[PDB]
């Protein structure tokens, strides 16, 4: 069903210490801080080393000839056991890093999968429920449950005919030189993974595959499994989180309410365990850290999507901002043209933090920034920033090399809810807090009757367990029915992201490009450019939001026909993107239909500018012209232009004439083009 | 665009006071003790009958006719002052309609006389504001209800014509409001009997709001069977639901099936009765549990549960009078003894002021029968007169099921080991949180900040230790990936449930089930239990069980195609879908399968009953025999019920075998002489 190296794969099963967990090098340091506390020296790193592979008899022994024949060796042992199921249960199994995103790979290819463990099934169990990763396997194997243990055969053999499947049609992970005989000597499909000790060259020769950790065997499957489709409004996220962290600099209207979104889905598979958002914001940071979520508002649909594991903190806090660009494998500068210069300091610190790290991937830094040549900008100024900061143009030079600087479109428009309407929400939903808490001591008291199963011991210590539990969570319940709405969102899903980045390779709601310029060009014309022209009809005809002027069917069939004159032009020029076009067509229209929030003020900013002859509005016109199509509603955004310039922002009626013609000049079109153009635009604008 | 009765629909304009909210009542009552405390003398009730559906300022014009401010503020500030104790009172049906009106595509507004700091301050505690994309207050209107201009703007900032849109009202003034807009006027009675004048304006009259939004349903298309990882609705109606037993099929499947509703709404609560104290307190403390689905990996969280004790009597009345929807999670055994508790149940429900759908889950041939006759025994010998008790029987539906999927109830043992483990995780978690004041003027007043820090700082004392459920979950259930559930027709409200496919001749399938499927399930459970597996998954890798399986599965199609040949053709889709579900139940243990031996080796069951009908034919019935046989030896060596009545039970069983007295002894020899074998 899953085809790996040729070879087609139906099960999988997983050694547990050393392949699945990091239990190994906790066994290490249980050694050496037993040794520490009972004979008061550390048992050295060199004798530990030496021990891997070892019988606990050849292990004592070896003891018994470097620290004295009375070396209290079974007690140390036992003792260390001790420190690592204490260990173990309060702070968790220590995860293989990777191992989740493999296991849901293997899954949702339909593979069979077990757990080969020499453990005994009692403490096996317990360490993959305790880990969360018992719901991935369908047998457990164990060491107490079989005549001859590794490296006979028998324990992998056995899982494999449970899971109804011969051992050849298996993926076997392990470390062991014993382990990886068994596995072998079964005939499956070996997959070693170097633990602490260096496999020597018998294990290399034997094994099949070899990875010097989990994630290379990673980054080696994803070739064969695939890339997620599009996600579609109100599809979940997956439940199974990894070990990243991801960084969202600006918990914005875009960084919160639509950014997050793309990294919740991340690649279907699993998702970051962290989400940082940096706020200046103390309200927002703290509502948000309080109910430990947040949810975004899709009108349309009337859909509350729930953003879980999110950790607002604030833009001026160093050792967090720091902790953000330390730890963070993508991050997504949200933040406005305005507010680049002053963040480049706080990102230089970041990556030169980054850089002194002693811990380790090279960073995906997304560039969300609606404007053309957003990069250079953000790169120009962080080039300055950390010149000033390091003194160091070789360091400096190195740090703006080894990263991936991402350009983006961004097509959603968001809506980020006001501190009135936040405290409002606020007040309402902890009275709902009150109204909860006052019949929770309603119920009371604890009672668990005579199962005639549980052992009067382990039947007292469940009623403090439930009792401790119900006391916590009860408070909380009201958050299943309940949100923190702080955003108001479109429906757009696709964000497109320029090709370099392995990162990116799998994140299923991104669309690579190898060059932004094509998507950017649509961007401009199609969105940007009818958003202006649609602006400026409303502006002059007095209505307050581009959303109230659709009311007037005159404003909403300008829009409709004015998208279709712009589709039919970039159709001729950008074939290959005909689909992206009929989708952000429709897009635009929609968020168009209710845009009561986002003023026309803004958008319709120095339209001399957008007027210009390689620009938004005449680009469009001259392209329709040159492949005979209709331009008669690109025409008249064109003189609305010129109309809201001498109007609003008071320009001389002579200096719209005078920069029309040079404009009109510089178009790829015939004399005979150029002057019918200009004697048809004059006369709409002395009408207006 | 919604067609409802021929008209085209393309927008909904609904009203706030009385017709959405019952809040109108309430203001009644405010206004008359705010003219009590400050002027004494109450308002009379004519003067506020003609104040239904008015402006503050057009209600304040009618008092001085007659005859404010400091009145109406009072009034106002004690009527949403109940609301912060008790809420705001969702007329019922309200949630439902606008969830089936917004997935219509319909462009959905708020049209009411209150003003704007106040129709939000409800839209919001009720959360309905989602399903309006404007709202229309008594604020930006010049000329308020009776006058159309509020119903006109509306529209108007909808994009669309009056006439394209519906429009919902309580009072007299509100309905000539929205008369005179021209637009397809709806008319819902609060606390007024409707006028001449006002009917003949209406073009549609309803006696509350659910009697509009069943009216409604019948132009809203069924949605269709729910796919595995398909959420659950957002929005929750006022209906509650039962399930009476909550076992490994009550919790682990029948909770799904109620969960996903109608995929508009969602019931409020579902109430399930169980003696498992453990599982009870469990389920109370976390708030939630999640059934897993192992083929994929996937935990699927059930939430709005309320575990109530079987025996607590009052909880089990309050489940049979409040809830739409009742599932009997129940084997044999228990029907008896708990015929008594439903007896109870369904004579205070009609002693208490809908129709009851009562599903009955149970694998036997002529499973509502004994429902039905424990229940009528039960009831007569409460009640004391037949007359009540025949009218119970035939008001509420009480329907037959067939339920496919195989599901696992988790042990106590296990149950324990797992909230020892997570115990542990959140004493942890609590260490964390140990080692908040809003800084700054973010737009507020220095009280509103003070008062936002109290808030939150509060918020967080009692949510910050729940952190720990985003990622934690209570898996009490192992469960298969089968969604559709099967039920004989009659109920009105299975047509509109999306998990329920309805059929006709549900006795021929449960026959075929009993005898193919949970024949074949027990017997080959039998075999494995007494060769070593403890799961049913990797048993059926064995190459003899899966053999015996294939020859059982043979030798009962052959009978069943002479007993039912108008089901012969699709025998072999059944039991291949059988062994499909068999092949990968690794969480599914043989123990759950092979329970109660000699109660499913009676003469009229699963194994019995198949070589009855081959015997009679001259059909092969080799397997089925051994497998009558590995029935008695399992139940006298693995749950040791004594040898000498194992035999009692046989001869007696195959007494009542409807066939010939030289059959009947042959079969008796040829069955003891191979269980004497098996223990050799
Ligand atoms: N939202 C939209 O409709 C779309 C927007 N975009 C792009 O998204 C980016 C952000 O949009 P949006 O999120 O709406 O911007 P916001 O106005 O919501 O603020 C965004 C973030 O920038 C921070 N910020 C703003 N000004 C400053 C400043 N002067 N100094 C320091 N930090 C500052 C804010 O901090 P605090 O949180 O403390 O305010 C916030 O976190 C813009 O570049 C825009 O072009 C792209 C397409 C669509
Ligand atoms: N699960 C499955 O795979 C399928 C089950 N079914 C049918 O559903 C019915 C039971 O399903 P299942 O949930 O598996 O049974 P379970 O034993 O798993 O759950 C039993 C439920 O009934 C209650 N109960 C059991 N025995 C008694 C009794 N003697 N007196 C009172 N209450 C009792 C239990 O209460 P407590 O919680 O206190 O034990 C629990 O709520 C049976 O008819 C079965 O054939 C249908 C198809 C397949
Ligand atoms: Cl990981
Ligand atoms: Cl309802
Ligand atoms: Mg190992
Ligand atoms: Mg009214």
């Known amino acids: 069903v899953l085809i790996f190296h040729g070879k087609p794969v139906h099960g999988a099963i997983f050694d547990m210490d050393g392949t699945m967990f990091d239990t190994e090098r906790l066994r290490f340091q249980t050694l050496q801080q037993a040794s520490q506390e009972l004979i008061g020296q550390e048992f050295s790193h060199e004798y530990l080393m030496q021990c891997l592979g070892l019988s606990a008899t050849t292990a004592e022994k070896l003891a018994q000839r470097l620290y004295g024949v009375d070396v209290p060796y079974k007690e140390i042992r036992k003792r260390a056991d001790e420190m690592e199921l204490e260990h173990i249960r309060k702070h968790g199994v220590p995860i293989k890093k990777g191992l989740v995103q493999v296991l849901e790979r293997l899954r949702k290819s339909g593979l069979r999968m077990a757990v080969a463990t020499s453990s005994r099934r009692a403490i096996a169990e317990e360490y993959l429920i305790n880990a969360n990763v018992y719901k991935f396997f369908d047998v457990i194997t164990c060491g107490d449950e079989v005549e001859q243990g590794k490296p006979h055969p028998e324990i992998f053999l056995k899982a494999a005919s449970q899971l109804h499947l011969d051992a050849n049609q298996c993926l076997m992970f392990e470390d062991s030189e014993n382990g990886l005989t068994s596995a072998h000597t079964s005939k499956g499909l070996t997959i070693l993974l170097k ?20 994630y290379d065997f990673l980054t080696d499957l994803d070739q064969f499994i695939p890339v997620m489709d599009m996600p579609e409004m109100q599809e979940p996220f997956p439940q199974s989180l990894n070990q990243l962290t991801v960084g969202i600099h600006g918990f914005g209207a875009i960084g919160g309410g639509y950014i997050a979104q793309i990294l919740s889905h991340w690649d279907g598979y699993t998702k970051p365990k962290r989400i940082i958002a940096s706020t200046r914001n103390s309200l927002f940071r703290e509502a948000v850290n309080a109910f430990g979520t947040y949810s975004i508002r899709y009108g349309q649909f009337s ?48 990556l030169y933090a980054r850089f002194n790290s002693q811990l380790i991937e090279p960073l995906t830094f997304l560039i969300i920034l609606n404007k053309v040549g957003a990069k250079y900008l953000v ?81 007292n210590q469940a009623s403090i367990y439930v009792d401790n539990m119900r006391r916590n969570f009860q408070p909380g319940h009201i958050l299943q029915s309940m949100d923190l709405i702080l955003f108001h969102s479109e429906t757009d899903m696709p964000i497109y992201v320029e090709k370099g980045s392995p990162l990116l390779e799998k994140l299923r709601q991104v669309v690579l490009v190898d060059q932004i310029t094509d998507i950017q060009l649509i961007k401009n014309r199609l969105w940007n450019g009818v958003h202006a022209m649609l602006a400026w009809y409303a502006s002059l005809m007095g209505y307050e939001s581009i959303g109230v002027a659709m009311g007037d069917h005159l404003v909403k069939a300008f829009a409709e026909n004015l998208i279709a004159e712009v589709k039919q032009g970039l159709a001729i020029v ?20 209710y845009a009561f929030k986002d003023p026309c003020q803004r958008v319709a900013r120095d339209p ?29 955004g064109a003189a609305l232009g010129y109309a809201y310039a001498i109007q609003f922002l008071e320009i001389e009626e002579t200096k719209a004439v005078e920069h029309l013609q040079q404009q009109i000049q510089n178009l790829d079109l015939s004399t005979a083009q150029r002057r019918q153009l200009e004697a048809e635009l004059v006369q709409l604008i002395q009408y207006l």
């Open 195 to 214: 633990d602490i000790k260096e496999p020597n060259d018998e294990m290399l020769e034997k094994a099949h595959f070899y990875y010097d950790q989990m």
């Open 303 to 350: 859909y509350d999507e729930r953003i879980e594991n999110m950790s607002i903190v604030d833009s001026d806090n160093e050792q967090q901002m720091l902790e953000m660009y330390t730890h963070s494998s993508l991050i997504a500068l949200c933040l406005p043209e305005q507010a680049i210069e002053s963040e480049s300091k706080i990102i230089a610190k970041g």
């Open 574 to 593: 950008l074939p290959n993107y005909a689909k992206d076009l009929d989708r952000m067509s429709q897009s635009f229209l929609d968020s168009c239909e």
């Open 608 to 636: 001399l500018r957008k007027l210009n002859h390689n620009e938004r509005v005449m680009a469009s016109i001259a392209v329709n012209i040159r492949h005979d199509l209709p331009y008669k509603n690109l025409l008249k």
């Open 379 to 459: 790169m120009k100024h962080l080039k300055e920033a950390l010149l000033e900061l390091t003194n160091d143009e070789d360091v400096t030079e190195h740090i703006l090399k080894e990263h991936y600087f991402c350009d983006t479109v961004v097509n959603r428009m968001v809506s980020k809810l006001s501190n009135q309407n936040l405290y409002r929400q606020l007040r309402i939903k902890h009275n709902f807090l009150e109204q909860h808490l006052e019949d929770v001591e309603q119920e009371d008291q604890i009672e668990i009757e005579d199962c005639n199963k549980l052992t009067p011991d382990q039947l």
